[PDB]
Design a protein around this ligand. Structure first.
Ligand SMILES: CCCCCCCCCCCCCCCCCC(=O)OC[C@H](CO[C@@H]1O[C@H](CO[C@H]2O[C@H](CO)[C@H](O)[C@H](O)[C@H]2O)[C@H](O)[C@H](O)[C@H]1O)OC(=O)CCCCCCCCCCCCCCCCC
Ligand SMILES: CCCCCCCCCCCCCCCCCC(=O)OC[C@H](CO[C@@H]1O[C@H](CO[C@H]2O[C@H](CO)[C@H](O)[C@H](O)[C@H]2O)[C@H](O)[C@H](O)[C@H]1O)OC(=O)CCCCCCCCCCCCCCCCC
Ligand code: CLA
Ligand code: CLA
Ligand code: CLA
Ligand code: CLA
Ligand code: CLA
Ligand SMILES: CCCCCCCCCCCCCCCC(=O)OC[C@H](CO[C@@H]1O[C@H](CS(=O)(=O)O)[C@@H](O)[C@H](O)[C@H]1O)OC(=O)CCCCCCCCCCCCCCC
Ligand SMILES: CC1=C(/C=C/C(C)=C/C=C/C(C)=C/C=C/C=C(C)/C=C/C=C(C)/C=C/C2=C(C)CCCC2(C)C)C(C)(C)CCC1
Ligand SMILES: CC1=C(/C=C/C(C)=C/C=C/C(C)=C/C=C/C=C(C)/C=C/C=C(C)/C=C/C2=C(C)CCCC2(C)C)C(C)(C)CCC1
Ligand SMILES: CC1=C(/C=C/C(C)=C/C=C/C(C)=C/C=C/C=C(C)/C=C/C=C(C)/C=C/C2=C(C)CCCC2(C)C)C(C)(C)CCC1
Ligand SMILES: [Cl-]
Ligand SMILES: [Cl-]
Ligand SMILES: [Fe+2]
Lengths: 34, 341, 334, 82, 137, 442, 36
């Protein structure tokens, strides 16, 4: 009997969600030519 | 049992991450300072404030990305999103350096929130607040360097930019212009940081090498129980070793741990004081007696005079690119140079 | 009962106010030779031609220096890595002019400090202790080896070792940055993390223990009198400390095994300073900090400066000015 | 020892967790990528593209030199590239 | 700014004919310059003789003028001193001396045009940085 | 009772599994030697100097005389291929025995055979295993002598005509020369064994070492430790490990200086110029340049009063001026033709500098062993362009790092071995704390 | 609850990090920031 949505859930996703999005953006950057 | 006491109940519940009343200040501010740094180092230029590339999007690596100070022409403007300079335009705000004040101001308020947090948790758990007190030292350093120092100068532009290489340039600036290594307040800070590092290593090793044999395993970590009353290492044998090796040793376990608090905290406070003087160009740059002798006596040379020649080279060779708003044009023939080089 | 065994018993005795030991047998004479010569030179030595260009630098107090500018000056670049004891000079005057005192001090010092490490092992053995305190001391010792011996070996001359003085130290680190870009070298970056982190953890551990002292005194006394030397029970409550610090961050970010915590306290600054000693020692062989000069260019090919290029401007200013008279040819290759 | 949340190691080894996150994680990765590859990121933040740091013959930085005319100075710099 | 055909247009000979390299040739020449020449000529200077750089204004006053594709391709085959008075194949890399400078062995005639083209385009992009030395770094 | 992170300590008294650990690990060393060579060859371009190509294994093979001809030029790459291939193949055999003895073979050996089984405290058996390995090593040293004297020779950077592969017919046997080296000072101008500057002394040294190791191998098979050795050492597996760690660390520091200073067994044609060499080359380069312009390099007074191009060492020799005065102990084949009895000879400098010496000096000054961690060649202030870090810098730095840590591991394991042997490596017995039974210091 | 073995999750996550860090190090040699 555990909850899914806690304060802890929020903190974790507040960091993890933009972290992956940013990793995608930086990945795309390696294929940019001048 | 009104609404305040109900909220107080909820803020102070034992959970994986404790919140508290200070979480209302700390968590938004800490998250926005961090979020602003990552946003800016990933996407934002310094082309209009500095003439620099500073983001991953522009080709910079982790060492060279930065969130840079605003342009010198902004003075000490708060640079609010909605203020007279950016006038609500988010894009212009980024290009004018608004992320720097955003990060620096939210950061300041986050540090307040964190210290409040140390006070709050100490009160609930029932211990003395010396961890909060020790944290005063990073606060003094933050506000003296990121707030008091540029406020004494012409603009935010001369504060530190938030980045690895940009901080390195700040170190060299302070040498060439302030001769900051010569400052007794920095020397005291250096002694405090190196002294703390020393104390940290020597206390960890002494404990680890005066352990009592409290188990049979060759891994000695298992032979400790967090509820045991007995000391896990011999203070008596440690005192004897250091007394014979070094001449003196600790004998009081509380004095030792207070001394560990005292040494780096004090060093940081001292260095903070010296930066306050540098806010006003109140440097310890020169020794007058040296200069009078050297001016009159072209054979008198010391390591002191040698370093000022180095300082003069730093100023003359970095200033045009590092202070672009001044439009310094130094023709080749005026640049200070030794032979051949 | 034999005269030699009586001497051996005194040397290794655990009852001497200061332990001597077999390592002590080498350390005491060498540290006294280095100390006495350093004091005398710091106060009275005449100017020394450190760069072999017949341009003496004044290091001693009697020759117009104060505590901050004074130094025992490195030996002449004309000597390079050649051994220069007193008995190789035609006179003490010559030996002083050419920087003899510096070689004498650093060689005796390096020997004595190496034996100091040995003596830390040795007494630990006589006292029934675990052996590894000397392993912690090897990080500062390696750092002293790097700036006094290893770096002169890589660059060909003891004149590029670190001067024995406060201003001389700064000259050494300013010249090092131009020539090697040490700020951009990851082993110096880890050294900073070892030393910043060391001071941090020192403050944390001191403040957590102090925060959880068990009440044992009145408000009119130093809490320190709550601890009696050699008492058996702990003087603070680690459960309270852990309970505070776990809630400050989160639970598993905090130590509750005091042996793990203190091993962590030892490891972090020691490993960080190993790396920084290694950074100096490998920059001795000119494997330098990262170089990102002109690494960003636009579509046409204009250079787009970064903070690394600004660092380079500062480095350039150090390069062109240091030893302003000692270079006849366009490259400063050592 | 526990405050009532579900243990992390129990979650990340649960199949339901991986059913949800094998979608959410790459979707976010793809999302950020397109933010860059469509060029949106340049326009949101005002970051020069490789061809828009200088005018063709220009050798000078477009350095903001006024406080209250700053927003308009950048706009004047930008139109000198069109 | 970008690499426009006007940028990539350089003199072919002393009679004022021009040639327009392509982006390909420019990057080809830059690669080849770094492989065969940059150990002494990084940035358009000359480490082993700083008095003589690769600036277009210096090349134009060489005898044989060398501020054009022809003069440069000739130089890489049969280099001479600045006044044209003596040949220096034995101390300067060239095709005439590829036996003693082995990196010159595999350069074809089109490689020489790209290298030459690179040397003439570059001061048009970098201005004073090309051949200026550390003052402009 | 060791934790997982100290897991390999569990093998101390399991001689079967510890054998496979050693043999499989020896497969990793031979594997890397094989693969690195094939990688280096696959990337090798013969028109470029080796030191412009980040090669460190091909230069060791070329130095043995394979693949190269006059002047150091690569003439045939098949020897490189073979050495890489044979090493790689061999690593599978060793890996095979390694994992067999680690997983399936008898967990301990002393029940299966009294020959291969050993006890660390058995001073007789230990010295016998030492003796076998001393003989193997002695054969190893003689294999180099064979190659030098009977199988095509070795590359000789000093050979007249620019360097060449030369068969060594008269190795130096005079013990006054061989052991004379071992008694030279390590300080400048002397350089201890790093000063060896001719292959006759090199080959002669290996004849002596081969014989001494074989003689010592047989001595240690036939004897047991004398009583004075018995009371002076700790006799345990960890203690022996600690001794070898000290020895490897010493060896690593010596190798570091060898590759940094020595240009005989590390020829500069393959590894690039040494530090001192490149610095001397710059002085030579501008001497040549200025003298062609009409400069009288013998009489030119520089800004300090010292000669701009030429000055005296502290013992009087004519040497190059400028900062390279510190490097006047450098000796190299492109420079030595200019040396007379008093140092550099002004009449040779004015008349006998050959174009190949001008070429070589220009080449070496522009390849000085200076560069950045990301392989930008030159001083720290140089702009991107030249991709170069000298093999001498890569080899010297890596082996200093390794040497340093193995000295730490010596301290770690020697201290522990002493404490383990005396019974207090796990901590102090509360009931019998030595200090508590000692009188107080005051 | 404990379906996917934790050591398998640790290996794939670890390989995934290596992939991305390797991509960033390849990019220091190509495109923007390469010096070419
Ligand atoms: C510690 C615990 C932790 C607490 C941290 C809490 C975080 C809160 C953050 C604080 C916010 C700081 C706002 C500072 C803005 C500022 O100052 O902004 C600066 C402005 C003054 O503006 C400056 O004014 C200057 C002088 O102007 C004058 O001189 C000119 C030349 O003659 C012209 O005449 C001009 O018209 C005339 O006005 C220049 O113009 C500068 O470019 C312009 O920036 O002051 C003002 O807002 C107000 C000035 C008086 C208020 C003083 C506030 C204290 C801050 C000063 C403390 C540092 C002391 C400095 C010495 C070190
Ligand atoms: C058992 C305990 C041992 C106790 C011993 C106590 C005495 C030890 C003394 C050690 C200090 C040595 C200083 C080395 C000075 C130096 O010039 O050393 C370098 C010398 C090489 O000398 C150079 O040798 C050169 C040889 O080259 C000559 O010959 C060559 C032949 O091709 C070339 O031709 C070249 O051009 C030509 O000059 C020249 O002679 C140079 O002038 C000369 O400087 O190397 C050497 O002798 C090789 C060995 C040096 C090892 C020293 C490394 C120290 C590492 C300490 C690490 C500290 C650990 C941390 C602890 C925590
Ligand atoms: C407690 C959390 C917290 C704190 C302390 C701050 C603090 C700050 N923020 Mg941050 N911010 C936060 C949360 C927080 N923010 C959150 C959650 C977000 C996400 C939306 C942001 C987004 C954000 C941006 C985008 C910016 C800031 C900025 C600022 C700075 C200027 C603030 C200011 O002038 O306020 C002024 C407003 C107040 C002080 C409100 C006080 C309310 C009073 C007490 C009541 C007034 C009554 C009412 C108005 C009357 C109505 C009239 C009626 C007739 C209709 C300051 C450092 C600016 C900055 O950093 O620029 C450099 C900026 O541009 N913040
Ligand atoms: C011939 C060399 C040699 C040998 C055979 C041993 C053997 C042993 N050592 Mg000693 N040691 C050595 C060298 C050696 N050591 C050196 C050079 C040092 C100095 C650093 C030490 C320091 C040392 C300590 C401090 C301890 C030992 C211990 C041990 C025992 C357990 C080791 C174990 O299970 O590790 C398991 C292996 C690991 C945990 C892996 C270590 C990970 C390393 C540090 C990272 C290396 C990666 C490298 C830097 C490149 C990075 C690439 C990246 C992809 C990872 C075992 C008897 C333990 C002991 O006393 O037992 C009696 C112990 O506590 N060793
Ligand atoms: C040079 C590296 C090296 C080597 C050769 C060994 C070897 C060994 N270790 Mg040590 N170890 C190492 C590094 C190494 N270790 C490091 C870095 C750590 C830290 C994580 C440890 C931690 C550790 C612990 C904690 C323990 C050991 C133990 C052992 C022994 C038994 C292991 C076993 O049965 O596993 C069983 C494993 C398997 C069956 C999995 C398959 C492994 C195979 C051999 C891989 C072969 C791959 C390759 C493709 C083979 C091709 C074959 C072909 C050539 C024919 C064995 C001799 C154990 C021991 O001492 O027991 C008494 C033990 O408890 N080790
Ligand atoms: C130093 C390493 C070493 C040591 C000490 C041992 C020791 C032992 N092994 Mg192991 N083994 C090794 C390496 C080693 N082996 C390697 C490399 C392999 C893979 C080929 C094996 C594969 C292996 C198997 C499959 C078995 C053993 C077995 C045994 C035991 C009996 C062997 C016997 O009677 O041979 C007596 C002597 C000989 C047969 C003569 C060998 C002469 C060799 C082949 C020539 C010398 C090689 C040369 C010097 C170096 C190579 C040259 C090259 C560079 C070109 C013994 C404990 C057996 C065992 O214990 O079973 C329970 C067993 O079944 N071993
Ligand atoms: C891997 C090599 C190796 C190893 C580990 C050993 C190990 C051992 N040998 Mg053997 N030995 C070897 C090779 C080796 N030997 C060879 C090749 C020979 C033939 C010459 C011998 C001849 C030999 C004899 C004749 C004897 C031993 C003995 C011993 C034992 C005592 C060693 C001792 O006291 O050293 C400690 C060293 C000393 C007390 C003196 C050191 C003197 C050196 C020269 C000082 C200089 C060091 C300096 C810092 C570096 C510069 C070099 C210098 C020369 C300039 C020990 C078991 C003894 C024993 O018990 O025999 C059964 C013994 O009497 N060995
Ligand atoms: C533009 C303006 C932007 C500003 C917006 C500001 C809004 C930020 C508010 C963030 C607060 C989030 C906390 C609520 C999340 C949650 O799911 O918990 C409350 C719900 C149930 O979770 C419960 O979780 C509890 C544990 S705990 O309190 O979450 O730690 C447990 O007691 C209970 O059984 C369980 O059901
Ligand atoms: C500003 C702003 C804002 C905010 C924002 C934010 C909030 C953001 C966030 C963001 C984020 C939050 C981000 C993140 C990202 C991250 C990243 C980018 C990461 C990376 C990392 C990595 C890369 C790592 C790696 C590693 C290493 C190195 C080692 C170990 C392993 C690992 C893997 C860990 C708002 C809107 C309010 C409005 C105003 C403006
Ligand atoms: C014990 C142990 C361990 C270890 C292991 C080891 C270390 C092993 C080794 C192994 C090895 C060491 C292996 C090797 C192998 C090899 C091989 C397998 C080979 C092959 C080869 C080939 C096949 C080749 C081919 C070719 C040719 C012939 C020619 C050219 C081309 C080529 C190259 C392709 C561990 C820690 C993990 C775990 C625990 C236990
Ligand atoms: C090959 C060669 C050569 C030769 C070499 C040789 C001949 C070598 C030898 C070497 C040797 C012949 C070595 C020796 C060694 C020694 C040592 C290294 C020692 C050790 C010792 C110790 C470590 C001890 C310790 C101790 C003490 C002191 C006291 C008591 C305790 C004990 C015992 C622990 C030459 C150069 C010509 C050239 C090139 C090649
Ligand atoms: Cl200087
Ligand atoms: Cl020079
Ligand atoms: Fe403690």
């Amino acid at each position: 009997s555990y909850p899914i949505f806690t304060v802890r859930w929020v903190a974790v996703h507040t960091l993890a969600v933009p972290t992956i999005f940013f990793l995608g953006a930086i990945a795309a950057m390696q294929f940019i030519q001048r | 049992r009104g609404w305040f006491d109900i909220l107080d109940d909820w803020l102070k519940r034992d959970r994986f991450v404790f919140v508290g009343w200070s979480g209302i200040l700390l968590f938004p501010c800490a998250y926005l300072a961090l979020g602003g740094w990552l946003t800016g180092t990933t996407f934002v230029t310094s082309w209009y404030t500095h003439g620099l590339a500073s983001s991953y999007l522009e080709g910079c690596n982790f060492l060279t990305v930065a969130v840079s100070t605003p342009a010198n022409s902004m003075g000490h403007s708060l640079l609010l999103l909605w203020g007279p300079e950016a006038q609500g335009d988010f894009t212009r705000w980024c290009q004018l350096g608004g992320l720097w004040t955003f990060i620096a101001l939210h950061g300041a308020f986050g540090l307040i929130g964190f210290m409040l947090r140390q006070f709050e948790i100490a009160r609930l758990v029932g211990v003395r607040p010396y961890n909060a007190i020790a944290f005063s030292a990073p606060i003094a350093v933050f506000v003296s360097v990121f707030l008091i120092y540029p406020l004494g100068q012409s603009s935010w532009f001369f504060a530190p930019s938030f980045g690895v290489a940009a901080i390195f340039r700040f170190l060299l600036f302070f040498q060439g212009f302030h001769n900051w290594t010569l400052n007794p307040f920095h020397m005291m800070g250096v002694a405090g940081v190196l002294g703390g590092a020393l104390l940290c290593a020597i206390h960890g090793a002494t404990v680890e090498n005066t352990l009592f044999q409290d188990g049979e395993g060759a891994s000695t970590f298992r032979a400790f129980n967090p509820t045991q009353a007995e000391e896990t290492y011999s203070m008596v044998t440690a005192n004897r070793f250091w007394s014979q090796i070094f001449g003196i040793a600790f004998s009081n376990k509380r004095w030792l741990h207070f001394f560990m608090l005292f040494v780096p905290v004090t060093g940081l406070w001292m260095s903070a004081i010296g930066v306050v003087g540098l806010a006003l160009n109140l440097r310890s740059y020169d020794f007058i007696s040296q200069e009078i002798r050297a001016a009159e006596d072209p054979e008198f040379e010391t390591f002191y005079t040698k370093n000022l020649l180095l300082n003069e080279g730093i100023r003359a060779w970095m200033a045009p690119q590092d202070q672009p708003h001044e439009n310094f044009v130094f023709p080749e023939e005026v640049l200070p140079r030794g032979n051949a080089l | 009962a034999n005269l030699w065994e009586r001497f051996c018993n005194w040397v290794t005795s655990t009852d001497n106010r200061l332990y001597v030991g077999w390592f002590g047998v080498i350390m005491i004479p060498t540290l006294l030779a280095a100390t006495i010569c350093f004091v005398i030179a710091f106060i009275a030595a005449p100017p020394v031609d450190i760069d072999g260009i017949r341009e003496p630098v004044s290091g001693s107090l009697l020759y117009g220096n104060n505590i901050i500018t004074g130094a025992v000056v490195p030996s002449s670049n004309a000597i390079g890595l050649h051994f220069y004891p007193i008995w190789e000079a035609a006179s003490l005057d010559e030996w002083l002019y050419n920087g003899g005192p510096y070689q004498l001090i650093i060689f005796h010092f390096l020997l004595g400090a190496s034996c100091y490490m040995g003596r830390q092992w040795e007494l630990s053995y006589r006292l029934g202790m675990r052996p590894w305190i000397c392993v912690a001391y090897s990080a500062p010792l390696a750092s002293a080896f790097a700036v006094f011996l290893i770096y002169p070996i890589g660059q060909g001359s003891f004149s590029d070792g670190m001067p024995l003085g406060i201003s001389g130290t700064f000259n050494f680190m300013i010249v090092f940055q131009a020539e090697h870009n040490i700020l951009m070298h990851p082993f110096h970056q880890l050294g900073v993390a070892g030393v910043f982190g060391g001071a941090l953890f020192c403050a944390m551990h001191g403040s957590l223990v102090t925060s959880s002292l068990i009440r044992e005194t009145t408000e009119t006394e130093s809490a320190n009198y709550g601890y009696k030397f050699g008492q058996e029970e702990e003087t603070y409550n680690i459960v309270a400390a852990h309970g505070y610090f776990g809630r400050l961050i989160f639970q598993y970010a905090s130590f509750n095994n005091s042996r793990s915590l203190h091993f962590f306290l030892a490891a972090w600054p020691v490993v960080g300073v190993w790396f920084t000693a290694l950074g100096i020692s490998t920059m001795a062989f000119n494997l330098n900090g990262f170089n990102f000069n002109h690494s960003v260019i636009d579509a046409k090919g204009n250079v787009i400066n970064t903070w690394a290029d600004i660092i380079n401007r500062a480095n350039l200013g150090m390069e062109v000015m240091h030893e302003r008279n000692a270079h006849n040819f366009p490259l400063d290759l050592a | 020892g526990t405050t009532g949340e579900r243990p992390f190691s129990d979650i990340i080894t649960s199949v339901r967790y991986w059913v949800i996150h094998s979608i959410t994680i790459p979707a976010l990765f793809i999302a950020g990528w397109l933010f860059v590859s469509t060029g949106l990121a340049y326009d949101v933040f005002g970051t020069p593209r490789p061809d828009s740091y200088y005018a063709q013959e220009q050798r000078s930085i477009p350095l903001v030199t006024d406080r209250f005319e700053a927003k308009q100075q950048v706009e004047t710099f930008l139109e000198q590239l069109k | 700014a970008e690499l426009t055909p006007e940028v990539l247009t350089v003199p072919l000979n002393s009679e004022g004919k021009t040639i327009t390299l392509t982006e390909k040739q420019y990057l080809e020449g830059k690669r080849l310059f770094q492989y065969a020449c940059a150990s002494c000529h990084v940035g358009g200077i000359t480490k082993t003789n700083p008095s003589l750089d690769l600036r277009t204004e210096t090349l134009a006053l060489a005898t044989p003028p060398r501020d054009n594709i022809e003069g440069l391709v000739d130089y890489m085959k049969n280099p001479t001193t600045y006044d044209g008075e003596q040949e220096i194949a034995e101390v300067h890399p060239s095709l005439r001396s590829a036996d003693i400078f082995p990196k010159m062995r595999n350069l074809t005639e089109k490689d020489l045009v790209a290298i030459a083209g690179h040397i003439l385009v570059e001061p048009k992009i970098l201005g004073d940085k090309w051949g200026g030395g550390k003052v402009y770094y | 009772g060791f934790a997982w992170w100290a897991g390999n300590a569990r093998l101390i008294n399991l001689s079967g599994k510890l054998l496979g650990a050693h043999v499989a690990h020896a497969g990793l060393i031979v594997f890397w030697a094989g693969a690195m060579t094939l990688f280096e060859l696959a990337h090798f371009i013969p028109e470029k100097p080796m030191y412009e190509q980040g090669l460190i294994l091909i230069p060791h093979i070329a130095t043995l005389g394979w693949g190269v001809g006059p002047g150091g030029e690569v003439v045939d790459t098949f020897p490189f291929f073979v050495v890489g291939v044979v090493h790689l193949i061999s690593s599978a055999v060793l890996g095979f025995g390694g994992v067999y003895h680690a997983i399936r073979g008898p967990e301990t050996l002393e029940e299966y055979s009294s020959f291969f089984g050993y006890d660390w405290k058995d001073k007789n058996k230990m010295t016998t295993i030492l003796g076998f390995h001393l003989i193997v090593l002695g054969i190893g040293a003689l294999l180099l002598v064979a190659k030098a004297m009977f199988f095509g020779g070795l590359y000789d950077t000093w050979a007249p005509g620019g360097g060449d592969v030369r068969v060594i017919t008269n190795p130096t046997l005079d013990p006054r020369v061989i052991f004379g080296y071992l008694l030279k000072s390590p300080f400048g101008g002397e350089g201890w064994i790093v000063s060896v500057n001719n292959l006759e002394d090199v080959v002669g040294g290996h004849i002596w070492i081969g014989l001494i190791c074989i003689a010592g191998g047989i001595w240690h098979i036939l004897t047991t430790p004398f009583g004075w050795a018995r009371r002076a050492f700790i006799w345990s597996g960890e203690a022996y490990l600690s001794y070898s760690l000290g020895a490897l660390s010493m060896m690593g520091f010596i190798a570091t200086c060898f590759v940094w200073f020595n240009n005989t067994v590390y020829p500069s044609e393959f590894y690039g110029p040494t530090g001192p060499e490149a610095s001397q080359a710059q002085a030579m380069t501008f001497l040549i340049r200025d003298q062609k312009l009409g400069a009288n390099v013998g009489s030119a007074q520089g800004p300090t009063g010292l000669g701009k191009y030429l000055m005296r060492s502290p013992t009087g020799e004519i040497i190059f001026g400028g900062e390279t005065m510190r490097f006047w102990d450098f000796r190299g084949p492109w420079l030595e033709p200019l040396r007379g009895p008093n140092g550099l000879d002004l009449n040779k400098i004015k008349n006998d500098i050959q174009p190949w010496q001008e070429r070589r000096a220009a080449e070496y000054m522009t390849h000085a062993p200076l560069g950045s961690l990301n392989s930008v060649g030159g001083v720290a202030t140089e702009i991107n362009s030249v991709n170069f870090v000298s093999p001498r810098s890569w080899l010297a730095t890596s082996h200093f790092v390794l040497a340093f840590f193995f000295l730490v591991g010596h301290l770690w394991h020697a201290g522990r071995a002493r404490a383990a042997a005396a019974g207090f490596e796990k901590g102090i017995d509360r009931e019998s704390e030595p200090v508590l039974s000692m009188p107080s210091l005051d | 609850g404990g379906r996917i073995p934790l050591w398998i999750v640790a290996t794939v996550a670890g390989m995934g990090v290596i992939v991305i860090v390797g991509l960033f190090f390849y990019g220091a040699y190509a495109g923007l920031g390469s010096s070419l």
